[PDB]
Design a binder for these strands. Sequence first.
RNA 1: GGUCACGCACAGGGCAAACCAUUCGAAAGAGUGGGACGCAAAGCCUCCGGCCUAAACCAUUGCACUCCGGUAGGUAGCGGGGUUAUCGAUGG
Length: 87
Amino acid sequence: RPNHTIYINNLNEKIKKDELKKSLHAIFSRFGQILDILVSRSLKMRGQAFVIFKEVSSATNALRSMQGFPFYDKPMRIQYAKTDSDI
RNA sequence: GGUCACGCACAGGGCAAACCAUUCGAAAGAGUGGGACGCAAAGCCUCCGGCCUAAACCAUUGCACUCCGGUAGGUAGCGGGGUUAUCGAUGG
Ligand SMILES: [Mg+2]
C-alpha cells in the first residue's frame, strides 16, 4: 500500500498547471522533501496530481494530515499511488 | 512561344527569423514600425499529418511518468497537398 508518491484526486480543474503545482508545493513541502510534482491537464490527467516524496513516512504524514482539505473549493482526496516507477 | 517539371545561373529584384518599440489577444501568438537568421514560392490557402496555447462553453472523478477530449485560436518560416507568380544556364 504505502508509496513514496501520493495521488491527489478531486482537484479543481480550472486552475492552471503553473499555479496548481505552486500551491501543491506550498501545501505539501512542510511534510518532507519532494522529488517532483506531476500535474498534467490532459483529459485522462485532469483534476489529479502526483506528489513524490523523498521518504515514504513523509508521504504517509501528508495523506493522514490532509485528507479532504478544502483546496480551491474542492476537498482533496488523497491515496497512495498504485505503483511508483520514479526510476 | 505555351505547358509539366527543374534551380549550378544570369536580369529585375522580392521576402524577413531572433531581438526591440507599439497595438490587439486569457494565452500561443498575430498586426504595424525598426531590424536581418535565413528563404526559388519564407506569395497565398488549415483539406491531411504534426507541434504550440487552452480562458470561456460542453464532456470527464480520471493512476500517471511517450504524448493525446471536444471546441476555439495559432504555426503556411515543421512537413504533405492545393493554387498563383520572375528569370531560363544548354539547363529535362
Ligand atoms: Mg521543495
